[PDB]
Amino acid sequence: TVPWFPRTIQELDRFANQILSYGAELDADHPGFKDPVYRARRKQFADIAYNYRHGQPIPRVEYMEEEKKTWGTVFKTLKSLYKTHACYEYNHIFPLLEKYCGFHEDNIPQLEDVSQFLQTCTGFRLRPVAGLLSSRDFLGGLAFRVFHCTQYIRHGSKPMYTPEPDICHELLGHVPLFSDRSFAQFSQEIGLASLGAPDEYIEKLATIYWFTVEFGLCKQGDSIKAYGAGLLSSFGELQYCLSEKPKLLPLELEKTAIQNYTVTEFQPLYYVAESFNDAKEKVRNFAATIPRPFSVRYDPYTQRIEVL
């Protein structure tokens, strides 16, 4: 039987409060989670996301000094690395975010402003959430060009890497490409294909998504660049992904989709795509093979799903 899936933008609110994690709360390598002050902050951001409702303007927040320092450190360090580590597409968009969206080392962008910016770029919009959502829900959101974005920031003790999708990851890793017309359309396409699909196909898509959109590498001329949002938000893993430590393999969905991966440490293996465009094509083609007893059509004027 077919699982329930949202058919309207307002319906996405149904699962908005269903949060998960990568299970690092007890990780001795990630002590930031045990920090009572840190937890108290997460609680504050969670409440905002819990009381939020579709359409509403995203509440502006006043970050603490620690959080501001973390952002600046992450920002300035990554900006330096992007010059030689990030793919062409990313580097061409980043300047625009800095000039028209307030992306600076001494300023944490407010989600409301980023959402307004994305809307004018590609119609994508932000939806604040307490934390990590399931792959089915997150992907479902993409169908309506909605990016469920966190608002809290990683613990200041380890800005180089965090397992969780904090604001740094959402803004520096995902937002840039969501502002691109082609990538935006690509994102919505796979999201549309996931609606009401069997979980065995959802998890498979999630794995493919992980090895491409999240931690993917691609050839650019005779060099290798990073385009995965998880690499682009971690100055620690960004250095590593192009070093001699990790293992590299050609991107092949049949193998990639069944490949194992870590969610609390640097990836031991990465898949290299012939090009950033070939990656999108490959993932798009697989998404179209996801079987289901029906077809879907999205009407942007009413923002509703049509089941055919």
Added chain:
Amino acid sequence: TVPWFPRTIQELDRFANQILSYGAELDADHPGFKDPVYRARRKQFADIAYNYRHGQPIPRVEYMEEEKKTWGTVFKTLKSLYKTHACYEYNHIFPLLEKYCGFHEDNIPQLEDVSQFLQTCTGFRLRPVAGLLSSRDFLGGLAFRVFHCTQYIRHGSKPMYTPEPDICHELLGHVPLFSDRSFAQFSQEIGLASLGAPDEYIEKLATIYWFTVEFGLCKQGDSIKAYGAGLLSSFGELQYCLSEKPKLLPLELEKTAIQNYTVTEFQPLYYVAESFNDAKEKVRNFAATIPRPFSVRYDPYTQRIEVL
């Protein structure tokens, strides 16, 4: 050379304040215009439209007793006539407007609520204007699914008919069909085809629009119904259009487009379409023949026109 045309929703504001009229200010048959109290009211509604800007919420207004009585008289009388005079499509939608949009004889709908309603139905939205806009501008608006709507009401001395497109005409005549998916798409299509087109094609389209969308009649089974917004808002002309007085001719664009028409009195002649659907098809086909040194594509996610 190609005339300027809006490429974004915000750009529509450029001509928003350019108002016209059907030149009845000196008509001895329409003395309501000379009424100083009436003029003072028009001035009030005009200022609201003049200070309005894209995106902004449409200001709510408090109508006077006279205006409320006029609406009730127009509403109750037309509702009675629709049962036997209005096309099937219209009568099927009207009930919904009454139940979900506040269309009642003892209540003049606020444009903000109507706009919100239309948006959920087909994505169409209202844009308050001081009065009659040129055909080029009005049609241009349709390209972005924007209906420039008046907010003032006809003079209470003659509720049966008015040359101007008052709120009664906008709400009772146009809104109903704009809430229909198929008609909405039809409207946007012709609007898209008008952008930057030579005026000789614009005026020709306007004439066709006048004899169909505004004062068109269509066969429904073995009977004849009215679907034109101008007939549906005038209980005076609604009675007349199906009487023995007017002259009827089969809808034929080649002749219709070059046919003369009045803008201050009941139409002496009407064109009958084989069906409400055939009318849409005919007008859509003609619109597609409008020549121009370029093609246009509308992106609903960014609400911008793409010149190809």
